[PDB]
């Protein structure tokens, strides 16, 4: 399924993911397509900061959800 990640520079990144993908998996995908190391990434969805070992589904992140990325 697809989700989106909005950056503060105005970019929208589209990711190919499964509900069971961990947040670290998602960070790795963002790195593959944008060059940002997982440890420089903070992801925000639905008033929560997303933790590495949990999955998209643990946060009720569904198809076409938009996450917000902030760099450290």
């Amino acid at each position: 399924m697809q989700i989106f990640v909005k950056t503060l520079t105005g970019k929208t990144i589209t990711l190919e993911v499964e509900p069971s993908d961990t947040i670290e998996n998602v960070k790795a995908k963002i790195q593959d397509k944008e060059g940002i190391p997982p440890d420089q990434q903070r992801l925000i969805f639905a008033g929560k900061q997303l933790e590495d070992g949990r999955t998209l589904s643990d946060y009720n992140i569904q198809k076409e959800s938009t996450l917000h990325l902030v760099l450290r």
Partner: protein
Amino acid sequence: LENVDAKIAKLMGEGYAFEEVKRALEIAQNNVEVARSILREFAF
């Protein structure tokens, strides 16, 4: 509708931690300008 996640991300980008920003936006009733003033004022 109010643009909460985008507002969190923006203020985090100004050099503040997630829990601080979340809490400041709550206090500010989602007003970015007011939350920013809180974050600047009480930074440590």
